[PDB]
């Protein structure tokens, strides 16, 4: 209903958010009746925006389609519409305007970087009528949303995946752009070193174990609190090893106590074979003695008659005993062939499994763009409660289409590498240079700077960008603490389709652990004949040094073994990502490094407020603002995250330089 637009705008339909409490304290502090009115108006206005986001939703249009007693209080409907508009919940992305842009602008903002974060903020600010100018070092928009293009060849070297549209801003963006979304067919066959598929049997019973090993770490973390180890924070990788080892340890521990339960038995059989031999002994004697005593032909005196009969009894007694002990010898000797027949598990994981498990890990290292040795055990999956609903998709026609759409009508200076950001009581100046002739110098004066510099860049030692004055310890410590990962792509273009065309993706399994990431997974999801090989894990780092050709080598080799040396052509043209080495990225995206938390994502978003110009003068406005995937706790390292981080700062900058709404 309306309830669905609240979920699609990532909001609870039935409750007011902290953001809302801040802006509508009268409402939220007061009568339960008015809360529900507020919540309907909000939910409805969202529904309205959402049911057609290609045209601006004016205050008028909203009041038009409202019911009574809701279109009663028009100040309240206004306050709500303006709130939604500011915080980028309605009229965001690429709408057809109704009332053209403010004739005369108010405030100047410099945005560093035309990433999705950048472009999203730019459009918001511009539409609130500010003078916005983006400074991009690259000769193109998009940053870490790159697409490769040539004839009909088309392949993202950047982001390629939409994480499914249930609460995804990109839901709306995709309705506003020629964005060919194609769901990802979840079948992914694996293929060990040699080339042989992995029997379905196994594939399942490793992935089973993988999922179990993770749950295991979550147990190890939450329940046993295994989160520091001799002063260092605990890695997920560390925990995973610990769990696996304790699984090898049990496998053995069980064998031990089984063979142990045999000797208990096999050494009871010994304590009996003894009684039974020292009875074949005692019975030997007794029989002789009875034979000898039956020698005495009758008639005999009653002592010799008794001696016969006595011995006869005595010997049928011991013949009973020995029959009741070979009773026992029978049972014990079965009980032994039982234990001989079902022996607990030989090993924990065949070295051929440990290799397939290593690919399930490689996949996790891809997702997180880092060695699992780096991920915070405690926090690596803090975003997990916020994932959208829906199957993941891919942009069939290049994700680039989105940045470019957003960039239309914005003042973007390409080939403008920011070198120094200065911020003071009175304003800011950004000193940039031309990327081509470095010595050609530019100076931008502005009321505010929005910094969408990537975390990799913020991290560069020595600094690519100088802050004057320098970022405070609280900010710089956050930047050191967070993880910035890496993850490359090999774009293989071919003359025709030599692979299963109903298969979106298929893994390769590396011989050793140390190379689990190395072209571990291939994607066919473009129209022309194109394969994408991921390098993830410790591998991504090292592959950047090894040369384009060698890589395309290791690459073809891997494909031949799986598709036969006949059907694998030389590639028409090839590309290799090198994101750690790209100085406008210094890597791929953020991760929760051990010894970080989500709270660092929050510090990264906190704007900086300069000291006062003259001592003893009032507290200034803050001047230096931050967006990008590293700034949004709840949707890190994604496009939608950046997109949102942008919308967010624009509202925060407008609230500051244009007064609240």
């Amino acid at each position: 209903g309306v309830e669905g637009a609240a979920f699609q705008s990532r909001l609870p339909h039935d409750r007011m958010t902290s953001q809302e409490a801040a802006c509508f304290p009268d409402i939220i502090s007061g009568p339960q009746q008015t809360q529900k009115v507020f919540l309907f108006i909000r939910n409805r206005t969202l529904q309205l925006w959402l049911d057609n986001p290609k045209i601006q939703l004016t205050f008028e249009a909203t009041l038009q389609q409202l019911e009574a007693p809701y279109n009663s209080d028009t100040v309240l409907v206004h306050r709500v519409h303006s709130y939604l508009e500011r915080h980028g919940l309605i009229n965001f992305g690429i709408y057809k305007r109704i009332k053209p842009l403010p004739t005369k602008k108010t405030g100047k903002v410099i945005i560093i970087g035309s990433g999705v974060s950048g472009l999203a903020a730019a459009r918001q600010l511009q539409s609130f009528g500010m003078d916005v100018t983006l400074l991009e070092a690259r000769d193109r928009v998009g940053g870490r949303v790159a697409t490769f293009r040539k004839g009909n060849y088309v392949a993202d070297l950047g982001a390629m995946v939409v994480t499914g549209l249930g609460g995804n801003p990109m839901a709306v963006v995709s309705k506003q752009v020629n964005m060919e979304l194609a769901k990802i067919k979840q079948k992914c066959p694996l293929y060990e070193a040699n080339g042989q598929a992995v029997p379905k049997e196994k594939d399942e019973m490793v992935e089973q174990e993988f999922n179990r090993l993770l749950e295991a770490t979550s147990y190890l973390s939450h329940q046993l609190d295994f989160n520091v180890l001799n002063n260092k924070p605990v890695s997920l990788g560390q925990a995973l090893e610990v769990v696996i080892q304790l699984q090898e340890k049990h496998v053995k521990d069980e064998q031990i106590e089984h063979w142990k339960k045999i000797v208990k038995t096999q050494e009871e059989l010994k304590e009996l074979l003894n009684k039974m031999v020292n009875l074949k002994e005692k019975i030997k004697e007794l029989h002789q003695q009875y034979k000898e005593a039956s020698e005495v032909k009758p008639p005999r005196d009653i002592t010799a008659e008794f001696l016969v009969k006595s011995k006869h009894r005595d010997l049928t007694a011991l013949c009973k005993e020995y029959d009741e002990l070979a009773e026992t010898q029978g049972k014990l000797e079965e009980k032994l062939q039982e234990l001989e027949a079902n022996p607990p598990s030989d090993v924990y994981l065949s070295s051929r499994d440990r290799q397939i498990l290593d690919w399930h890990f490689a996949n996790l290292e891809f997702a997180n763009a880092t060695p699992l040795s780096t991920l915070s055990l405690k926090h690596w999956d803090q975003d997990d409660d916020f994932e959208f609903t829906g199957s993941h998709l891919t942009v069939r026609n290049g994700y680039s289409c989105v940045p470019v759409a957003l960039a239309e009508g914005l003042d973007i200076k390409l080939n403008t590498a920011v070198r120094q950001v200065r911020y003071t009581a009175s304003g800011c100046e950004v000193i940039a240079v031309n990327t081509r002739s470095t010595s050609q110098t530019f100076i931008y004066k502005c009321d505010a700077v929005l910094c969408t510099l990537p975390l990799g860049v913020l991290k560069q030692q020595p600094p690519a960008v100088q802050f004057v004055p320098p970022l405070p310890e609280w900010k710089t410590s956050a930047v050191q603490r967070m993880g910035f990962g890496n993850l490359n792509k090999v774009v293989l273009c071919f003359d025709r389709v030599f692979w299963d065309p109903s298969v979106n993706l298929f893994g390769h399994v590396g011989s050793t652990t140390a190379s689990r990431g190395e072209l571990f997974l291939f994607w066919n999801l473009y129209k022309a004949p194109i394969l994408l090989a991921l390098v993830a894990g410790e591998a991504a780092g090292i592959m950047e040094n090894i040369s384009d050709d060698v890589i395309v080598g290791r690459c073809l080799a891997i494909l031949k073994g799986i598709f036969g040396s006949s059907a694998v052509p030389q590639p028409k043209e090839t590309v290799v990502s090198r994101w750690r080495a790209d100085p406008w990225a210094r890597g791929s995206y953020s991760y929760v490094a051990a010894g970080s938390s989500g709270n660092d994502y929050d510090l990264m978003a906190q704007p900086i407020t300069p000291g006062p110009s003259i001592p003893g003068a009032p507290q200034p406005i803050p001047r230096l603002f931050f967006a990008g995937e590293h700034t949004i706790r709840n949707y890190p390292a994604t496009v939608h995250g950046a997109l949102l981080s942008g919308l967010r700062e624009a509202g925060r900058i407008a609230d500051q330089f244009l007064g609240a709404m």
Binding site: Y219, D253, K270, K280, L286, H287
Partner: protein
């Protein structure tokens, strides 16, 4: 929640596999060794046992004595009275034996006798003999 089923992780076990740099592969080889010990101890007690089975090869078949099936009479012959005393002399009160020995007295009759004659066969004096053993 609680550790995924089958997966085993005691509090105590984790300390053991972390508390130094390779307490890992100590505790693991420790068992690899303390295993092959128990496997070799089985080999002993399996060969020790297959000797004692050689030594029993025969069962007790040559040494077993046919079952005399006897008509549990109530006639006390003077023959039977003496057998009885001598059994009392050598079994104490194991009335079951004393029946099996005579071979025509139910444990009833043996207990009967045991008091009827009693003073006539100084059975007190006789039983106090089975004491010195």
């Amino acid at each position: 929640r609680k550790p995924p089923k089958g997966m085993f992780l005691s509090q105590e076990d984790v300390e053991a596999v972390s508390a130094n740099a390779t307490a890992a592969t100590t505790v693991l080889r420790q068992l690899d060794m303390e295993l092959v010990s128990v496997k070799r101890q089985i080999q002993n007690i399996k060969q020790t046992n297959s000797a004692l089975k050689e030594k029993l090869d025969g069962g007790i078949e040559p040494y077993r004595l046919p079952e005399v099936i006897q008509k549990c009479n109530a006639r006390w012959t003077t023959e039977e009275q003496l057998l009885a005393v001598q059994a009392i002399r050598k079994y104490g009160r194991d009335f079951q034996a004393i029946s099996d020995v005579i071979g025509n007295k139910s444990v009833v009759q043996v207990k009967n006798f045991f008091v009827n004659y009693r003073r006539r066969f100084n059975i007190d004096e006789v039983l106090q003999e089975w004491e010195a053993e």
